[PDB]
Amino acid sequence: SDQTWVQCDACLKWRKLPDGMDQLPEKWYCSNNPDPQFRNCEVPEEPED
């Protein structure tokens, strides 16, 4: 299985999402992240493997 990421439409950072989060809104922002660690646009983008 691969890692899904979504891009914040405000800050353009990519955020990892839980597997099987298969339905998203049209626009998505860091503030909507289920993970509170990455729920602010100021938090750096996680690296790729």
Partner: peptide
């Protein structure tokens, strides 16, 4: 939303 998929070695 804009999404992408990346390799994840652990899985």
């Amino acid at each position: 939303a804009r999404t992408k998929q990346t390799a994840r070695k652990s899985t």
